[model samples]
Target: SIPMPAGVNPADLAAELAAVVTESVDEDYLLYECDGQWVLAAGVQAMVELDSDELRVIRDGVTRRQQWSGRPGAALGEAVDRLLLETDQAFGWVAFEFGVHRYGLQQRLAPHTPLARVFSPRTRIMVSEKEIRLFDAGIRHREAIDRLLATGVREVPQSRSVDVSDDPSGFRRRVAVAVDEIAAGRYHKVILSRCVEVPFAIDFPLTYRLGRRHNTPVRSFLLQLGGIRALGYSPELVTAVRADGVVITEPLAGTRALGDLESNSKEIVEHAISVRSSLEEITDIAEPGSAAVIDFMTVRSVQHLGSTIRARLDPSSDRMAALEALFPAVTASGIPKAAGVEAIFRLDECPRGLYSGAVVMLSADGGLDAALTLRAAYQVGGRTWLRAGAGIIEESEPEREFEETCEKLSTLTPYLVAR
Candidate 1:
């Protein structure tokens, strides 16, 4: 088992945490982001695994290719169930997800990893009523942002998106172009994003309120996590680890995000995404040896992350339902949805695999949370897949929107580049 590093120093955070990756099973969704000096790094740490082999055949993405298939789905699912039933498990939490391979059934862990997270220097994050503090040291992020801005980049917070260009307009033109690329055998699936400056600084409670504004199912995270909140409308789970040892698979059946939503131009052809979500709750299913349990309360989620979309996959067998649930999620992958995935992968040069894949953790106590790996770069031993892509529909543009994709990641750099 990897031990938590000596001190929570900001600069040493990435290095100390990377040390845990050596010759170990891919059992941790470790993460940490700090607004102040004493940085925080965390991810789910799995104690026991069964039926992991069942996980592979279903997840054929490049990153999924590298994982060891250690257990079976039927048996594995059962184990996670019992862990939850017993009401006792380990410390960490994990959200499981899958995306429509580079494209759609998109699922990523929310309780854990999310696509991107940004921290602002000015926003007052409350520690309590009297204690408000800004993020202390955002060095690595600063550097990343600086590098991109030097190359010419710009952004608007999520609140301010003025480019409501019609389908033939700049926005839809970019997306349609990506779609054409996918049809031409360009790529599998890549993520696309747009940046908007919120109309106002997003307050904690307001953040919670927004997801539900369009009928989205926003997740209510634990309190200790400063001034941040996450949203969820995803319909998949990577699978869960619980205390009772009985497997639990509670998946979100439907989802709808902005990228896939229709505007003025593409309204006729485009399918309007539905905001109302269907909750899929199933208990008492898992491999014979395992138990499962989950506590959305005990965990503290990242204040930096965007709304979350979570789902579970059971590669335990080569069945459609097991794999179908994991593909083309509304949050991780855009809607309309298969064409959207192929387009992004076609335009981008990077390989996405698990870079956008998710991680799930189960401790001795069986407590867990899963997350998506979008915003955080994975520098395992020597390599750094610090990357980002955008969702291209009929409403996307090339250069300007490219900057927007860069916008989502600007948080990684320190000083703004002179653009």
Candidate 2:
């Protein structure tokens, strides 16, 4: 019989999870963590198991791109070898992060995910029609986020207060303008981030559930959050991956589209203009028309966004080859590329972390997938932190941009009440 594990305290369960994973998996685990900036996104979930044996095998099939057959199932017959078999992915095993900040799956012990842990808590909570109206009438509903650029703000603040910025506006402005200027043009993408500090100590268990909320594509409310119930154990496979190359660049020129439920229609407009809109990720990916790496990415996406310089030499001999090969993916550098790299070093105020950088684990057979960490928050010294950012345009407004950042933040709250 399933024991009454649900009632167990979270802190105590975290330790139990540590034991189970250490005993099950062979090597050290990795969890999404952030020391790169101020603090890490708190209550981060991991993906230890997918809850079913059939799914686990399928995950392996994806990395290898194989077909089911025989013991490990029938070989898909296509010699697809995507899981970094011979190809190098940039990265090194950092002992420190692995020790305390290793990735943990959502739930390794049971079928129910920790993300499901949230449905009950939020369900009992009620939202008033008037309260919803005020939140819906959020003031940040004006201008692009990059316009918020001003000298009063220093490097992205680490501590969050119960202020408007805490909800999401303050962060959006600073990061976007910084990225656009930093981007010499190579990168058509920039994702700025921050920690959202709330007044009450957040219940990690409940948050683990909420984090899973966004895992679903916005169109369909399929809340299949990565495993979150294995005694607070987050699987490294599903944990954050910062193995993505580290470079500073800015948002490609474009417009910040509406991020609410009406995003699909907004996307139709963005799809037509984004110069970097590549059709490759569409037809090729198994889930066609799904959220490809570069759609509805909060910042503006321009039609002819690109740079004209680049330094391309093979870092083939590097130990972190896998991470290095992806150095120039459209995000860090632009279509033309050179300008984007130049922009990052020149304008970005602070260094980016494993937050923008990503970590991805491939299965032995070679299927591959990854998650980008944005709209994130963390904690340090008892204060919470939140990070927000946007894409930029030449016509960006500093004041209006700041407010745009706030509106972008509204994505997180259940409802808002202007203070």
Candidate 3:
């Protein structure tokens, strides 16, 4: 751990972290920023990956595996706990499809699809306004990182043009179907998303810098690991568990343009239903009488109606239980999780790998933070795209919902830098 040199800003550090990952060979890293603190985990020392059938762990080249049996949350929690016992922290993500197992929709996902990946990095650096701390100073890139931090040289990349326009016809169709389903008692609310192809390779780091400058998100992350690369400005948290056993989940629903501060009746209802659902989910794993809505119907800078649900963990429960109860935020999924998930699987053309999943941060101190994956750009298997969704209630209009998705997509689309 070392003091952050004077004259360096968060943007400078962000650029340096980006440079390290971009210049390194076969080095995977996660750079997560929350509340002005940035954590960079580079070079994996140990990793735990979950696929359709099993959870596998590899440390120092030795491998062990566990078959998926009971609740996936329990299995994953146990694995993470064991892994952390050997290391100080781990950073990774849980795919949106992981909820299929929790919601009994496992068969809906294709065989052997990667569901989650968590790893303890060989180089861990924490940067805040006052200091920079390094967990493993012996890493190969230490010299490069030190020089970059000292110089704080950030070169702005040249912007490239890529088409962000797509036929909204399909998204409109899905929204129509979801509304009809809701009217037919299928589900109360569902967030149906559509992907817009980026047509060109993306410069993830440059895009992250640009997007971060423009957006005011609750949490933001940039990661390149396990064959998937993504950067996002997340508007809400799926769940955040403190070391003291307090759990908090913020659900953001109901949207309008930034110019409109007052929420209409429809937006109000949408936000209320989402808040209610979040409270109920938290209550399941919270101690009796410990769950409560602390902040209700507040307007966020992103033009969304937000609520903060707080709880104390039940004696028998842990951070994973709280997380599992609200794996995919109601704002991302729907009221009745099972019905919403099923409808999404049936209506959407492709599976949402990490679109509505989470970028999770776990520490040895028993604290966990997960940000909902929204307002992001993704690159997987050479296919680059952007995805966004709007929460649909019975009062939703297809055209309005399509417009809402456009509003959400605007957060990242304009900042995309083509490779």
Candidate 4:
């Protein structure tokens, strides 16, 4: 049974963790809050630098090499169950960069040392329509966290963020080129990203608060690990795995302002392509329908046409391979993944890094939940990168797609400004 200490608030605890953690990115600091659950983890109890089944091994705790396949999955079961039983909890992310799998996947794990997980104590917390719940995992750092939480957080005005990349004309030309390639049968669709750099080192905690207010994301995350600090408000759940053999993926396609959801034919068609493409690669879908349902998701900036695909996993299936089949998400990589990947390689100015990737949360019970990295901003060295993109279909207009990119980035633009 999970332990529940009284009087713990997730928001207060998250703020405290954000403050005390991140002394060094070489050390691990992970923060995640979504759907009334939160986790703030620090230090690395175990680490995995993923390459292949043979080479992959948890640095501490679990002593087993990565093996390709097994029945009833003893490898994953043994490692995860023991870790959680001993530590009380374990939370880490598995992220894949855009087009990287075409070369090779760079996956890493930081099983948080002294993991701190927060959730509802017993019943769901409710006040208004529904209130956010909070729980504490009871760590030794409680004294430090209590002080930090007591101090409370103060907001600061951010610097005026700047756009430091290609001109609209250049972006238009690139859009035109992408459309032309799609017309020439390169790929059915290709999502293009724009790198808009801000001139200041962003205060991610403050920015996260701002985004939560406006964006209303289904998933909000902050992770600082070994030179990569990624925090975002993502509207889509890329994938999820349950302790039961259920697998689910939500592919959100199309793009429009909230007001234009009714009249955007182009967006609707593009969304159809995304759904069809996702269904093509997946089989044994646990349903009566192929593309099960469609709905319009309205967020702060743009609206998306979203669909879900769910299936039951084969008991002996290789977990990583199952996820691979669904990723380089159709919403990001487009149809005919091979050609779309090639287009992203040839057209995109630099590597997408993790922009089109995901931040995952995994559990000891073979449970996983991940949010696609979108509506996000991250810092690298001297630059703050705010990444956005548009889906380019045959009917796509260069200028219009460019405008879509701008619209997607609009939600986070204000918080990115200079102080």
TM-score of each: 0.39, 0.37, 0.89, 0.73
- The residue-by-residue lDDT of candidate 1 on 1-419, one tens digit each, is 12222333222223222222211323222222223221122222222221112221111222121133222232333444443454322222222223332223233212222221111111111121222132322454334323432442122114312222221223335555665664565532234533222222232222222222333222212111111122222212433433443333332211122223344324222212311111122211223333222322111212211222223323343222232233333344544445444444443332343333333433435344333334322233323222444555433556655665455443322111111
Please report, as a residue range, the 10-residue window in candidate 4 with the lowest summed lDDT: 114-123
Candidates sorted on TM-score, descending:
3, 4, 1, 2
lDDT of 4 by residue, 1-419 (tens): 12322354444446435655443233456677767665566556654333223323354456454444331123333444545554434554443342244333223212321111211111111111223233342453444445555664455454355553355436688788989988898777777777777766777666665666666655667766535666777535767776786777666622321216678766567666666655654453333343343333333234445667666666455434445556667667666666776677666644565576666556556676655665578776667778778777788897778777777777787666342
**Model 4 TM-score, 2 decimals:** 0.73
Q: Tell me the lDDT of model 2 at 412.
A: 43
Top of the candidates by lDDT: 3
Residue lDDT tens for model 3, 1-419: 66766776675576577566558657779888877888788778888898878889987778887787766677788888988997878889887887777678887678777778899888777878888777775746777777676666566576655444565439888888888999999889788887888877987877788777777665778888888889887634658999898999876622331115365776677677778877878888999999999988876544566678889986788787677788766667777877888888888755687788878889899999887776578888889888877778888897777777777777887778766
Displacement of the residue 199 alpha carbon in candidate 2, Å: 6.3
Report the number of the highest-TM-score candidate: 3
- Candidate 2: C-alpha lDDT: 0.27
Q: Which segments of model 1 are wrong by more than 4 Å? A: 1-176, 179-190, 193-328, 341-351, 363-367, 380-382, 415-419
Worst lDDT run of 10 residues, candidate 2, spans 115-124
| Model 1 TM | 0.39
Error of 3 at 418 (Å): 2.5
Cα-based lDDT for every prediction: 0.30, 0.27, 0.76, 0.55
Candidate 4 Cα errors over 4 Å, as ranges: 1-13, 23-27, 51-140, 164-170, 253-268, 284-303, 417-419
